Design an enzyme around this catalytic site. Structure first.
Site, PDB file in Angstrom:
ATOM      1  CG  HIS A  38     -14.152   4.160  -7.411  1.00 30.10           C
ATOM      2  ND1 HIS A  38     -13.004   4.069  -6.618  1.00 30.10           N
ATOM      3  CD2 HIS A  38     -13.111   3.653  -8.171  1.00 30.10           C
ATOM      4  CE1 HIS A  38     -12.596   3.111  -6.306  1.00 30.10           C
ATOM      5  NE2 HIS A  38     -12.629   2.654  -7.654  1.00 30.10           N
ATOM      6  NE  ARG A  68      -6.132  -8.124 -10.390  1.00 27.84           N
ATOM      7  CZ  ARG A  68      -7.100  -8.217 -10.177  1.00 27.84           C
ATOM      8  NH1 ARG A  68      -8.181  -7.664 -10.492  1.00 27.84           N
ATOM      9  NH2 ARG A  68      -7.471  -7.002  -8.694  1.00 27.84           N
ATOM     10  CD  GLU A 101      -9.647   0.631  -8.123  1.00 31.24           C
ATOM     11  OE1 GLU A 101     -10.522   0.543  -8.578  1.00 31.24           O
ATOM     12  OE2 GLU A 101      -9.336   0.628  -6.388  1.00 31.24           O
ATOM     13  CE  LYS A 106      -3.170  -2.976   3.351  1.00 31.22           C
ATOM     14  NZ  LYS A 106      -4.302  -3.385   1.969  1.00 31.22           N
TER      15      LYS A 106
END
Ligand SMILES: *C(=O)CCCC[C@@H]1SC[C@@H]2NC(=O)N[C@@H]21
Ligand SMILES: [Mn+2]
Ligand SMILES: [Mn+2]
Lengths: 671, 312, 91, 192, 95
Positions: B139, B222, B206, B117
């Protein structure tokens, strides 16, 4: 779906889409490949090749694209193999199996199948490699030098021929091939072909014996493969011309057979030449066999089958150029001391290594072996403990330990043997329907001399008539018919001849004296006339002129050997016939298999057409099918297995048809 | 240069890989566990082998050494990890390449750099991307593919905003409501990071959008479940391209047919739904049982990458 | 799925035990179920009687191989069983 | 006075206790007790052919008592064993009628009768008689088919674990009832 | 019957039980008479002298203890008792 001819037939409208034309076409092919419609001939294979054609992938095509493409039409039926298997299992689950007691699929124990890697076995250099490096003569010279007793396992052939009606399937053999390769890495040979196996494989088991041979060859590349070969007819059921014997030996050697034990049912050397010459040509090992009868210990038993008879016979077969002398004690008549005295004498007599084979039906087999080993025997035939004893060979496991404290050791791996025994102990269970009724040692063999199976076969047969009570007389008549026929060697078919007369005479209440008196009107059994016709060769003592006359009833007996009288088989005709019958191209194995067993082979091709390759099914499924809620796996290659689940069987409909609800490879199916 | 391929996964993703590889005329290999003895993905491949006959049906898919043992004993020269098993596992890729087997995905340091992280944040600061605080968030994540030849492209964003707790529910591609130049600044920022660390194969960046600003969250190294949704609007096949990058092929080459950066555009809109066995009566919890009746759709626009539900 | 209200009683086909799975207790011999001593979810000690079966006028007492919790009891009192039928599952 | 045979006197590595001179000492001890006959009960059929020759050879030198040898044919070497013991001058052996012999039972009298042909010592019995008895019992045995043993093959693993009589079958039945059916190799090993 | 596979009473092969007249048996003088004449010490001394191997038949006891769970009944033993007496007339003992 019910498809009717009344509308424009359309099953699926397939459409692909991608960023490039190349990819869209490749997706189309893939999709059509994934499509599988059975029951009715579709148009998929045409559509496949249309997309596959390179003249399409480039673009720039005309309306005459179909007209100007010859390779667009192709003969490819796509043999629906899975359906055929689903049908077999479906049939045996409902209607049963030949000579198998119709009952629910029995509970069996897990057979842990020990394994040796193929790369380890490829590193082994056993007697197969020896033959490749030193030839047949070199092998014999090597056997002679060994102090240890070399062994030949019979588990794959004569053991189950004796104990389980030759019913042991390729599948059960293949499963321990890689372990067997390791266990018997130092053995002389593995008997795994010949005898009744060729015939039984094709006819009863409906599997190709050549595939058994070829698949065991790959899996066991290190040990010599041995087969039994009858001198008159190789592996067949009648008489054949010389070129038929030659073709079979050529093919068997190519396929992987290395040692051919050549025997004659009357010890007639003349009938052994053709097989011998064929084997010599093939560059393989030719074992000249002396069948054993009488009792060399008892001088009151035969004025013919004395000790010097066997020495002169050994000396003869050595002059014939056989690489190894084999003693085939077919009825287990070689008593311990007789073994010692006989092999002992033959060792001085000839310079060939002696290969001894007996049956344990008297229960004195191991003793016979022990005694032979003291006399300096080179090789002996044994079986894995769980497939040994009684009408089989002596237990290798037992012998290994039996020799502890004695000069000569059995060259083998006991740990391996114990492991193999446990395997076969569980497998044998799959074949309980074919268990012989012989379950204890019988010493009456020393009087009647009935070989291998016979004593049980000829007991059922004695019951199948009206003689089931008075089998005492049959046993006696058998011994008298032997002496009536001038004291003969008794193996197949000579053994059936004597057998058939014993029944016949008892049946029609015949004396030895009244078989001549009434013989002019008697009508003897076909095998008997055949024998006095010379159709299975010449006996040692010859034929009583009067008896022969009375039996033949005017017919001429052959002077020379049966093979000489026979028209050579035109193998082209055979090819031309079998190619008409089948899809097209046919092999030499097919050709020679047909010649030996025309009808049996024909029936096999009929089953192959219907159910496909049955040899791949596991024995319990082969014999019993499947119970409700069972899942069965069928191995084809590594990760190429058919997964079959049986859900239910319906009630029979108006036509007596039962619907079987399957699940194959995840797909639901109805048979 | 790949002859045959193994999928280290199960279910819908495996079937998707087998279809892609068979399209590239590449042989396919599948693995299964004790409880997946009758999973659909077992049959859709050319070769199927059991992994860990002794180990449990849950642990079986996450056994690095045993999956290699199968690949070795089958001449497999390429393994596709799929998603959510050993896809983000570093020592799996190392072990694959050690046995001469191509790991289909990013290189060793990419998973190492985005696995933790903290490290998957130190890289973003080194490539100019924000983090420290959030209210009324949107998101959005961008799809990124780059080869072994230095060419990296984006396939626009995904609107992964419809979500419960720790679970995505509904995706949308492309994103709705966001101004034309807002989504530009997201995609450009996504390339900003991925071209900076020389990213190889498929990947995702993200982001969290509030009002009018980018915010880096994490990197999925991935293929994700929601990958299909983007393929339909872009036209480009993600899974297929993955295999093609493993062979060493150029992006805009004759084999992938990938359009140029200003040639890639979205057509219409797309929406994805995952069909699990969850329900608000048991509060989104799975159930055991035979699937008595399976009724599927199809047709125009509807895309079906199935795998688990069938006959029963 | 429809439950058949006692018309067959014994003609219920039990699954077959996984012989390699040490949690599966299969029937060694065919027979009848005399007494069911345990229930699904009950903790048992090793060698504790779980079932009493009747083969050929002879009562066999099926016991727990180890310490564990019963997960499924396949049979009821008076049920008929065949060799290899799954009877109990434990952990 | 019976000596139960165990171990393997052929193998110096097998036991330090059940030696050739352990049996001599025991037999001599039983002689002084005033047993009329010395007997060797080989309950697990462990007395290998050569061992039998060695043991009876020595025991006949040790004691003046007749030796009455009792073996089982479970190994498959029972007849060979008996033959060897006869060579070493055994006085009495335990046999059975053919159809009631072999395997876990006694060696066959019928077989042994013919086995000795050509050898110096001959079995004092009636073969024609025993063939008849064998035929009889072959039929009677049919009535008792529900009680037939599990054993159908010889078993040499008996030389490692040494389980007597039918135990290696019974204890396997037991092993199944405890859920150790797939692990019987472990049981056999532990037994040893 | 307990532990008997519940099938209808099977058809068996008829054994025609061989018998020897009890008169012929009374004239026999085997090892039972020897014990009565010379005693246990004497019987042992006699066995020493014998060159032939003497046998003990275990059919009545150990053979069926091993093969048939000791289930062989008296009726079957007593049926061939007279024949057994004749067959083993020179045997050491019957177990
Ligand atoms: C009974 O008719 C069911 C069909 C089973 C056929 C099989 S194929 C192998 C065996 N040989 C034979 O002739 N029938 C059996
Ligand atoms: Mn033979
Ligand atoms: Mn005993």
């Amino acid at each position: 779906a019910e498809i009717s001819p009344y509308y424009d037939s359309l099953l699926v409208k397939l459409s692909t889409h991608a960023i490039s034309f190349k990819q869209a076409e490749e997706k189309m092919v893939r999709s059509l490949r994934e499509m599988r419609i059975r029951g009715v001939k579709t148009n998929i294979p045409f559509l496949i090749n249309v997309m596959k054609n390179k003249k399409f992938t480039s673009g720039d095509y005309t309306t005459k694209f179909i007209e100007e493409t010859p390779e667009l039409f192709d003969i490819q039926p796509s043999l629906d193999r899975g359906t055929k298997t689903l049908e077999y299992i479906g049939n045996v689950t409902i209607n049963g199996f030949p000579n198998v007691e119709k009952r629910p699929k029995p509970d069996y124990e897990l057979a842990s199948i020990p394994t040796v890697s193929s790369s380890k076995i490829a590193s082994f250099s056993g007697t197969k490699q020896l033959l490749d490096e030193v030839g047949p003569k070199g092998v014999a010279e090597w056997v002679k030098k060994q102090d240890d007793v070399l062994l030949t396992d019979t588990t794959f052939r004569d053991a189950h021929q004796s104990l389980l009606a030759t019913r042991v399937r390729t599948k059960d053999m293949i499963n321990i091939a890689s372990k067997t390769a390791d266990v018997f890495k130092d053995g002389f040979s593995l008997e795994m072909w010949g005898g009744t196996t060729f015939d039984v494989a094709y006819n009863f088991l409906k599997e190709n014996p050549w595939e058994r041979l070829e698949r065991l060859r790959k899996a066991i590349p290190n040990v010599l493969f041995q087969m039994l070969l009858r001198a008159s007819n190789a592996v067949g059921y009648k008489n054949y011309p010389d070129n038929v014997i030659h073709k079979f030996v050529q093919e068997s050697a190519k396929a992987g057979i290395d040692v051919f034990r050549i025997f004659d049912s009357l010890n007639w050397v003349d009938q052994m030449k053709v097989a011998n010459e064929a084997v010599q040509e093939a560059g393989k090992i030719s074992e000249g066999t002396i069948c054993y009868t009488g009792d060399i210990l008892n001088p009151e038993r035969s004025n013919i089958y004395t000790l010097e008879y066997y020495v002169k016979l050994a000396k003869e077969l050595e002059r014939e150029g056989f690489h190894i002398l084999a003693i085939k004690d077919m009825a287990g008549l070689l008593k311990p001391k007789a073994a010692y005295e006989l092999i002992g004498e033959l060792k001085s007599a000839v310079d060939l290594p002696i290969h001894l084979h007996t049956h344990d039906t008297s229960g004195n087999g191991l003793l016979t072996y022990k005694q032979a080993i003291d006399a300096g025997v080179d090789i002996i035939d044994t079986a894995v403990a769980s497939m040994s004893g009684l009408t089989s060979q002596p237990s290798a496991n037992s012998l290994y330990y039996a020799l502890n404290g004695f000069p000569r050791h059995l060259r083998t791996d006991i740990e391996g043997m114990e492991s193999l025994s446990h395997y076969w102990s569980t497998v044998r269970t799959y074949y309980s329907d074919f268990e012989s009724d012989i379950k204890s040692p019988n010493t009456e063999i020393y009087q009647h001399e009935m070989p291998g199976g016979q004593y049980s076969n000829l007991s059922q047969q004695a019951k199948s008539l009206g003689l089931g009570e008075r089998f005492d007389e049959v046993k006696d008549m058998y011994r008298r018919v032997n002496f009536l026929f001038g004291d003969i060697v008794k193996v197949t078919p000579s053994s059936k001849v004597v057998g058939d007369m014993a029944l016949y005479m008892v049946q029609n209440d015949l004396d030895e004296q009244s078989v001549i008196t009434d013989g002019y009107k008697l009508d003897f059994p076909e095998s008997v006339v055949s024998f006095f016709k010379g159709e299975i060769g010449q006996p040692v003592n010859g034929f009583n002129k009067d008896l022969q006359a009375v039996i033949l009833k005017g017919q001429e007996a052959l002077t020379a050997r049966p093979g000489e009288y026979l028209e050579p088989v035109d193998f082209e005709k055979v090819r031309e016939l079998l190619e008409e019958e089948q899809q097209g191209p046919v092999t030499e194995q097919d050709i020679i298999s047909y010649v030996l067993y025309p009808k049996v082979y024909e029936q096999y091709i009929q089953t192959r057409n219907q159910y496909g390759n049955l040899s791949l099914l596991d024995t319990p499924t082969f014999f019993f099918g499947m119970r409700n809620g069972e899942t069965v796996e069928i191995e084809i290659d590594k990760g190429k297995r058919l997964i079959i689940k049986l859900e239910t069987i319906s009630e029979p409909d108006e036509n007596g048809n039962r619907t079987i609800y399957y699940a194959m490879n995840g797909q639901a199916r109805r048979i | 240069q790949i002859k045959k391929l193994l999928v280290a996964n199960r279910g819908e993703i495996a079937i998707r890989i087998f279809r892609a590889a068979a399209e590239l005329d590449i042989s396919t290999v599948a693995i299964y566990s004790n409880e997946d003895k009758s999973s659909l993905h077992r049959y859709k491949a050319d070769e199927s082998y059991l992994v860990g006959s002794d180990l449990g049906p849950a642990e079986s898919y996450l056994n690095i050494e045993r999956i290699i043992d199968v690949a070795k004993q089958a001449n497999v020269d390429a393994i596709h990890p799929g998603y959510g098993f050993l896809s983000e596992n570093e020592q799996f890729a190392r072990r694959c390449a050690e046995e001469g087997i191509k790991f289909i995905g990013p290189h060793l340091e990419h998973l190492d750099m985005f696995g933790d992280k903290v490290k998957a944040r130190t890289t973003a600061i080194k490539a100019d991307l924000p983090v420290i605080p959030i209210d009324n968030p949107k998101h959005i994540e961008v799809q990124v593919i780059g080869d072994e030849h230095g060419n990296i492209v984006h396939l626009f964003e995904r609107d992964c905003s419809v979500q419960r707790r720790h679970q995505k529910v509904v995706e949308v591609a492309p994103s709705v409501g966001l101004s034309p130049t807002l989504r530009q600044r997201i995609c450009d920022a996504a390339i900003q990071l991925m071209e900076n660390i020389k990213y190889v194969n498929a990947g995702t960046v993200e982001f969290l959008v509030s009002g009018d600003e980018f915010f880096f969250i994490e990197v999925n190294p991935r293929v994700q479940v929601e990958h299909t949704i983007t393929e339909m609007v872009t036209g480009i096949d993600i899974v297929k391209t993955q295999i093609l990058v493993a062979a060493g092929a150029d992006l805009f080459g004759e084999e992938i047919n990938m359009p140029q950066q200003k040639d890639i555009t979205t057509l219409g809109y797309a929406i994805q739904c995952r069909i699990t066995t969850e329900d608000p009566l048991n509060d989104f919890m799975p159930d055991t049982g035979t699937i008595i009746a399976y009724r599927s759709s199809g047709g125009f626009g509807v895309r079906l990458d199935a795998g688990d539900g069938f006959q029963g | 799925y429809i439950k058949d209200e006692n018309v067959h009683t014994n003609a219920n086909v039990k699954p077959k035990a996984d012989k390699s799975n040490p949690s599966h207790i299969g029937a060694q011999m065919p027979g009848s179920v005399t007494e069911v001593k345990v229930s699904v979810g009950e903790t048992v000690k090793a060698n504790q009687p779980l079932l009493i079966t009747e083969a050929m006028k002879m009562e066999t007492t099926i016991q727990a191989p180890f310490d564990g919790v019963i997960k499924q009891v396949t049979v009821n009192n008076g049920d008929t069983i065949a060799t290899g039928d799954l009877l109990i599952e434990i952990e």
